[PDB]
Design a protein around this ligand. Sequence first.
Ligand code: MOO
Ligand SMILES: [N+]
Length: 227
Amino acid sequence: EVQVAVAANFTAPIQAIAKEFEKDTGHRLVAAYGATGQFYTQIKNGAPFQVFLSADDSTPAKLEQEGEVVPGSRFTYAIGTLALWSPKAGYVDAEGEVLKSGSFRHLSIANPKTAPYGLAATQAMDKLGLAATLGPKLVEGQNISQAYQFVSSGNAELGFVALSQIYKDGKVATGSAWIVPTELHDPIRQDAVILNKGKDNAAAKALVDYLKGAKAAALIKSYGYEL
Ligand code: MOO
Ligand SMILES: [N+]
């Protein structure tokens, strides 16, 4: 009986971790998907969420500075990666030269004010020196999922997506990708946290002990995350 707030980049991963979770603990994971900032606002307004799996480390810590976090519950459950991606296999090269020289008019990022992966996109465009040239071409999704769908659907020619959305057991499994090297943005450290309303919930404690387990660790590394 555990309400879980899940940043959009971890939509697929948690649905999968929850099948084995239910079968192993008897507790059912009911999760909501969206942007980290949106969940921040909802949690501050009394949303019933009990566990918050963030796409950052900063916002769970911010909720702890604001008294919404069980102290001692904050841990890192996943480290993500940003990838320039397009379903079209010809378009996005393996050094990502298209950012510098492409002919594309639409570039999908996540709302960088609410979506950690969107902030990583803006950071990498900053340190690449392509902020002024790429800014006008940007288009924002409410969350990283919507930014990926803008490309998948055809409303943009490429976008900065979460590696979890294009990654196999080892490999990018679809389209054309450029692994954004980590030197260009802050590492995408994703912190989990138990909220005020999970202080003595057994489904919450069971879930965060299982997110540190072996079944969940093997699934989180199947999606391209590191630990
Ligand atoms: O997973 Mo996010 O918070 O939508 O970038
Ligand atoms: N194509």
